[PDB]
Structure 1
Amino acid sequence: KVFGRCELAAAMKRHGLDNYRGYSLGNWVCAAKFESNFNTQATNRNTDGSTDYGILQINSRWWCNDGRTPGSRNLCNIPCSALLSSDITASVNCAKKIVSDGNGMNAWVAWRNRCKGTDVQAWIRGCRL
């Protein structure tokens, strides 16, 4: 599923991501834009043999099981395919764990490089939330 911008904002808010660990909703929307283009089906292989999955490009070495990743820990206790569903629940729950790991949203490279320090509230402008 390719979410609309405000559609994704509303889903993330309903799931309690807004202000989670102090990250306002626009941070999450911005991260998802650059990580996946709001596409739940997005996947990308990493150099180490792991793969990133879903709207927030969650990695298979630490967080989810994809059956093919060296050193997998599956800390979210889910198949990585669960992160590709049109229902973002599993991605949100796992993102909550990731952002609580100590480095906040710096876990997401695209957030660091393209969202952090910017006017992230722009990402929810116009939305009814």
Structure 2
Amino acid sequence: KVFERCELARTLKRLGMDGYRGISLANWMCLAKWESGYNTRATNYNAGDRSTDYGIFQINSRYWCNDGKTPGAVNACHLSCAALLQDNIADAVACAKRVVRDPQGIRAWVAWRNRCQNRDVRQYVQGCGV
């Protein structure tokens, strides 16, 4: 599913993402935007380490979810990477919260640092009433 801006915003907010660990809703929105364009079926394979990024937040199979074909894989989120390509993003949000619980925070995602960190990200939530 490809969420519309404000539709994604109201959802992430009801799932307790606004301010989760000091991270604003606008920031989560910015990450999802550049990471997948709000598309839950996004995927990206990394030939270097044989891993794949899944979903709207592009959660990597090497450390977070199990896709069954990644070497030295950990399943820190304890779920199938397939659960991360579903229309209902409850599991993706839950695993996203787990990722940011590590010392690095949202900085774990290179795309967030390059396109969201230290920049005005207000446009992402203006007009949604969140």
Whether TM-score is above 0.5 comes out as yes
Relative to the length of structure 2, the TM-score reads 0.97
Match of 2:30 in 1: 30
**CA RMSD after TM alignment:** 0.6
Q: What SS class does the counterpart of residue 95 from structure 1 fall into?
A: helix
- Taking only the aligned residue pairs, the percentage that are identical comes to 60
Relative to the length of structure 1, the TM-score reads 0.98
CA distance in 1 between partners of 2:116 and 2:36 (Å)? 14
Match of 1:123 in 2: 124
Count of matched residue pairs: 129
Q: Which amino acid aligns with 1:20?
A: Y
> Structure 1, residues 83-118: CA drift from partner, whole Å, max 9, x if none?
111111010000001001110110111100000011
- Listed as ranges, the gaps of 5+ residues in structure 2 are none
CA distance in 1 between partners of 2:14 and 2:112 (Å)? 21
Match of 2:81 in 1: 80
CA distance in 2 between partners of 1:11 and 1:85 (Å)? 14
Offset, 1:128: 2.1
Offset, 1:41: 0.3
CA distance in 2 between partners of 1:116 and 1:110 (Å)? 9
CA distance in 1 between partners of 2:116 and 2:10 (Å)? 19
Q: Which amino acid aligns with 1:110?
A: A
Offset, 1:121: 1.9
Offset, 1:34: 0.2
4+ runs deviating over 6 angstroms: none
